[PDB]
A = this chain, B = another copy of it.
């Protein structure tokens, strides 16, 4: 599997509103092919950006969503953005273990 993280620059003070918007749209990507879930991570130390950590079965699955449906879903909305930049960080999962055994 792969991990695609949007590392989003959020002005100081804007975090609560950004979190509210993500919580409201939390199920926006549900059932997209190859999609395995996401987390929104609020920065506490060592990073100032929020990390939007998304998980996919493959890079092709991610690319299909990001280039097609993700973009199309924007028409007929528009409130924001509060973010002032983003960087996509892309990775392959080498290992994934749980906490117990």
CB <8 Å contact, B23 and A95: yes
- Residues on B with beta carbons closer than 8 Å to the beta carbon of A53: 3, 53
A60 within 8 A of B: no
CB distance from A36 to the nearest CB of B (A): 4
Residue tally, chain A, CB below 8 Å to B: 43
- Given A101-B27, A101-B31, A93:B3 Cβ within 8 A: no
CB <8 Å contact, A101 and B30: yes
- Given A30-B101, A31-B101, A37:B96 Cβ within 8 A: yes
CB <8 Å contact, B91 and A44: yes
A71 within 8 A of B: no
